[PDB]
Amino acid sequence: GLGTARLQLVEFSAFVEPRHLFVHISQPSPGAPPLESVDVRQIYDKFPEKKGGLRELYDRGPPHAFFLVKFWADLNWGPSSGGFYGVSSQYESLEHMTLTCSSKVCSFGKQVVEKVETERAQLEDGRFVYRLLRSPMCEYLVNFLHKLRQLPERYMMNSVLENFTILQVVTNRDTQELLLCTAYVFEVSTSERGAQHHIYRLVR
Numbered sequence: 001g002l003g004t005a006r007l008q009l010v011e012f013s014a015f016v017e018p019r020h021l022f023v024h025i026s027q028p029s030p031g032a033p034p035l036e037s038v039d040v041r042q043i044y045d046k047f048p049e050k051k052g053g054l055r056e057l058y059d060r061g062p063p064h065a066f067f068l069v070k071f072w073a074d075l076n077w078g079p080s081s082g083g084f085y086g087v088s089s090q091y092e093s094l095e096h097m098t099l100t101c102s103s104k105v106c107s108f109g110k111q112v113v114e115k116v117e118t119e120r121a122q123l124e125d126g127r128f129v130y131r132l133l134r135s136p137m138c139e140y141l142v143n144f145l146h147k148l149r150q151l152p153e154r155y156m157m158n159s160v161l162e163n164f165t166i167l168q169v170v171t172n173r174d175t176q177e178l179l180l181c182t183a184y185v186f187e188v189s190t191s192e193r194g195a196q197h198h199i200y201r202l203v204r
């Protein structure tokens, strides 16, 4: 699903503990179609046209490394204020690498946060795992979430979320090769339905 032959996302979650998951991707399924495709041009405007913009990134390639994730987030938690707010990601590969993971939080197409982490490979069960667990969510997101959950209707959450996107670029720190680039877009789910996602391939 979300992965190349060089690097596969295994698990992704954003969550709060006093554990509630806002979003969750866990990664095998028989019959399962290939991923649908979205024209990358439809979303150039969700991220900045600057350097590290989607167009420029996609221009360098390779194109099979580019995915769109639509999240229907679950923002229904509490009996709250405080809590630990975290993001956990797990990647895996057959090759030994060091990773640079850049996340760019974007509001109306403008970058308001860039977070850069590094993770070195760890051998486990005959492959390399890259575990970036319990990374503290930046304060911008935490405040944003705190406000977003006060909104009295889900349609109003959706209207606010239509201007909020995240771009993640994962590169091979040594060679500077793009390994994975994921654009994320957001709506809200009900707590009854729970969080969901749909992964697409970006093409051009």
Ligand SMILES: *C(=O)CCCCCCCCCCCCC
Residues within 6 Å of the ligand: 014, 022, 023, 073, 087, 103, 115, 136, 137, 138, 139, 141, 166, 186
């Ligand atoms: C940390 O500060 C940035 C890490 C980048 C990924 C954040 C994604 C998680 C946000 C969940 C939002 C839920 C709906 C708006």
